[PDB]
């Protein structure tokens, strides 16, 4: 149907906008601390601590399959990156501190993303 095409075009355009958002957030992690999944070879107990691991590569895979239907879903995954790290790692660590800085800098980006998603529809 034509309605199904139009809905698909909207999803494609959301995907474009979320790819630009993802790039902008990942620039706020210049150490690449959040770039890849925590390795279960290197942190064998990780899944005893963190039940829903997340990282920028995993989000990029979902995004390229058009697997985010709305901005809320995308933000959920970004918050997992931050929140998982702030639980597993202590305050005095470069990991925790990287997550704080990513959260604070990412807030700005996400605030305007929400306005764009609402504005363009």
Swiss-Prot record:
Superkingdom of source: Eukaryota
Domain Bromo stretches: 9-113
Cellular location(s): Nucleus; Chromosome
Glycyl lysine isopeptide (Lys-Gly) (interchain with G-Cter in SUMO2) cross-link site: 41
Summary of the tissues where the protein is detected: Highly expressed in testis.
Function, in words: Scaffold subunit of various histone acetyltransferase (HAT) complexes, such as the MOZ/MORF and HBO1 complexes, that acts as a regulator of hematopoiesis. Plays a key role in HBO1 complex by directing KAT7/HBO1 specificity towards histone H3 'Lys-14' acetylation (H3K14ac), thereby promoting erythroid differentiation.
Subunit structure: Component of some HBO1 complex composed of KAT7/HBO1, MEAF6, ING4 and BRD1/BRPF2. Component of the MOZ/MORF complex composed at least of ING5, KAT6A, KAT6B, MEAF6 and one of BRPF1, BRD1/BRPF2 and BRPF3. Interacts (via PHD-type zinc finger domain) with unmodified histone H3. Interacts (via PWWP domain) with dimethylated and trimethylated 'Lys-79' on histone H3.
Protein name listed in UniProt: Bromodomain-containing protein 1
Biological source species: Homo sapiens
Gene transcribed to yield this protein: BRD1
